[PDB]
Amino acid sequence: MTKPLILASQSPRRKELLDLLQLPYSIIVSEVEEKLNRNFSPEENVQWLAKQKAKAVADLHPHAIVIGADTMVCLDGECLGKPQDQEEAASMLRRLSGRSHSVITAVSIQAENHSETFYDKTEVAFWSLSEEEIWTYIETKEPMDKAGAYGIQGRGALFVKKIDGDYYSVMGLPISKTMRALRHF
Amino acid sequence: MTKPLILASQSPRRKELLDLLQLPYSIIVSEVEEKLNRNFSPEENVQWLAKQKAKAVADLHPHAIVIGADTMVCLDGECLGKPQDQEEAASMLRRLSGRSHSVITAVSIQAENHSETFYDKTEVAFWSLSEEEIWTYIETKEPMDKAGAYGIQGRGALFVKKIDGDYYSVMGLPISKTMRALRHF
Numbered sequence: 001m002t003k004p005l006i007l008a009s010q011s012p013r014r015k016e017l018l019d020l021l022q023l024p025y026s027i028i029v030s031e032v033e034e035k036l037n038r039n040f041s042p043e044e045n046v047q048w049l050a051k052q053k054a055k056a057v058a059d060l061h062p063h064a065i066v067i068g069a070d071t072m073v074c075l076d077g078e079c080l081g082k083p084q085d086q087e088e089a090a091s092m093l094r095r096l097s098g099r100s101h102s103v104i105t106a107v108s109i110q111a112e113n114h115s116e117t118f119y120d121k122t123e124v125a126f127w128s129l130s131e132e133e134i135w136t137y138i139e140t141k142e143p144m145d146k147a148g149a150y151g152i153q154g155r156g157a158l159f160v161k162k163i164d165g166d167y168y169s170v171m172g173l174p175i176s177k178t179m180r181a182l183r184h185f
Numbered sequence: 186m187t188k189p190l191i192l193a194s195q196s197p198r199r200k201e202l203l204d205l206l207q208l209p210y211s212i213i214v215s216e217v218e219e220k221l222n223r224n225f226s227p228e229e230n231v232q233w234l235a236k237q238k239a240k241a242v243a244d245l246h247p248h249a250i251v252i253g254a255d256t257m258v259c260l261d262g263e264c265l266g267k268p269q270d271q272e273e274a275a276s277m278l279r280r281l282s283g284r285s286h287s288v289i290t291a292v293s294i295q296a297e298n299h300s301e302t303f304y305d306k307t308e309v310a311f312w313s314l315s316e317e318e319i320w321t322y323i324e325t326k327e328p329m330d331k332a333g334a335y336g337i338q339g340r341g342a343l344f345v346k347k348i349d350g351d352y353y354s355v356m357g358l359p360i361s362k363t364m365r366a367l368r369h370f
């Protein structure tokens with residue numbers, strides 16, 4: 001009951017989840033360079049990014065706790081970001097089809113006397129998909145807003161065959177863990 | 186648990202306190218430059234140093250959980266370091282004397298899937314300290330390697346009227362806060 005909570009994120013999904021906690025908080029973001037260094041692992045980066053996002057806002061609210069977060073879709077070491085065009089979206093899906101990939105979401109929490117950052121990994125298995133299925137879904141323009149060219153919610157759910165890990169993390173924020181780190185505040 | 190635990194400290198006090206966890210671990214020799222930037226605050230720099238010690242060892246042993254810590258004796262936003270082996274210890278002992286000062290200790294825990302830094306702050310109040318008392322405390326090398334020119338342990342124990350925080354943090358390691366944090370590693 002001493003410090004205000006801030007969610008450094010404009011992702012509706014991250015908002016939907018954090019409300020679960022039932023904790024009054026504001027939404028405040030400050031753009032930061034999403035530069036990703038090649039000679040660095042995805043886990044390193046996803047963690048570095050979520051760190052940057054939270055700090056840029058925490059530097060503006062020293063006496064606040066700020067939650068940064070970031071998700072990556074990776075398979076075979078490579079990680080697919082958001083599609084630049086409806087066509088790269090189709091390519092990304094063609095790659096995820098009928099197999100598994102990793103979804104890495106890193107969460108960073110900053111305060112002046114305490115800081116915590118960690119990542120959560122989940123394996124996602126896709127049914128084999130078809131052009132019709134791929135383009136129809138692309139129509140919705142959903143894949144266009146996410147990394148990996150797909151959301152696990154909505155029409156995307158039909159591609160996921162199963163996961164091993166945390167559903168909410170694949171959505172952008174692992175609430176169970178996030179809620180548990182906050183308890184140290 | 187699947188990661189080995191490592192203490193990146195040369196400190197015999199941090200070792201005795203860590204043993205209280207009855208958890209197997211090993212001790213590694215860290216080499217880092219205690220160069221602290223004057224632009225930053227005490228609470229910041231200390232966290233930063235703990236964070237550097239740990240990161241140095243985690244860098245070599247990426248599969249492990251690394252603990253690093255650092256303690257400071259600050260009086261009025263001014264912090265007293267280690268005497269270059271002169272009247273340094275004596276003079277500052279005349280500063281603390283008959284008043285309170287802050288002992289700030291920061292603990293950093295590194296791992297490739299989770300990192301955590303925080304700091305404990307304890308208020309220390311002394312009785313008025315005399316000349317005969319300080320120097321007699323000096324001979325025994327004791328007040329010349331522990332920042333502040335005193336050790337709450339040993340002879341310095343007599344200089345202390347009371348503390349307000351965690352005695353173990355003053356020794357250099359808030360073991361109770363450290364353990365809790367580890368339940369999440």
Ligand SMILES: O=c1ccn([C@H]2C[C@H](O)[C@@H](COP(=O)(O)OP(=O)(O)OP(=O)(O)O)O2)c(=O)[nH]1
Pocket residue numbers: 008009010011014029030031032033034053069070
């Ligand atoms: O191409 C971009 C554009 C923005 N951002 C970052 C900057 C800022 O930290 C945040 C703003 O929200 P945005 O919707 O752009 O990104 P997100 O990753 O979808 O969600 P979040 O709000 O958590 O960043 O995203 C990037 O990393 N890359």
Ligand SMILES: O=c1ccn([C@H]2C[C@H](O)[C@@H](COP(=O)(O)OP(=O)(O)OP(=O)(O)O)O2)c(=O)[nH]1
Pocket residue numbers: 037040048051233236
């Ligand atoms: O352009 C850069 C600079 C640094 N890094 C990474 C590697 C470097 O080792 C780390 C710096 O520390 P980080 O920001 O990961 O965490 P921190 O130690 O908690 O930050 P601070 O130095 O603000 O305490 O960030 C990058 O990816 N890109």
Ligand SMILES: O=c1ccn([C@H]2C[C@H](O)[C@@H](COP(=O)(O)OP(=O)(O)OP(=O)(O)O)O2)c(=O)[nH]1
Pocket residue numbers: 193194195196215216217218219238254255267
């Ligand atoms: O002027 C200096 C130079 C170095 N150091 C630090 C960083 C260096 O790595 C370490 C070497 O001695 P030691 O490790 O014994 O220091 P400590 O402060 O007792 O604890 P730790 O072992 O956790 O570093 O001390 C200082 O505190 N002051």
Ligand SMILES: O=c1ccn([C@H]2C[C@H](O)[C@@H](COP(=O)(O)OP(=O)(O)OP(=O)(O)O)O2)c(=O)[nH]1
Pocket residue numbers: 055221222225229230233
């Ligand atoms: O060389 C130094 C000396 C001290 N500090 C302290 C003060 C600072 O507030 C804190 C956190 O690091 P910083 O403020 O540099 O943030 P960053 O630029 O995000 O760090 P990084 O370069 O690791 O990404 O560590 C440094 O960072 N760098």
Ligand code: NA
Pocket residue numbers: 116181184301366369
């Ligand atoms: Na924690």
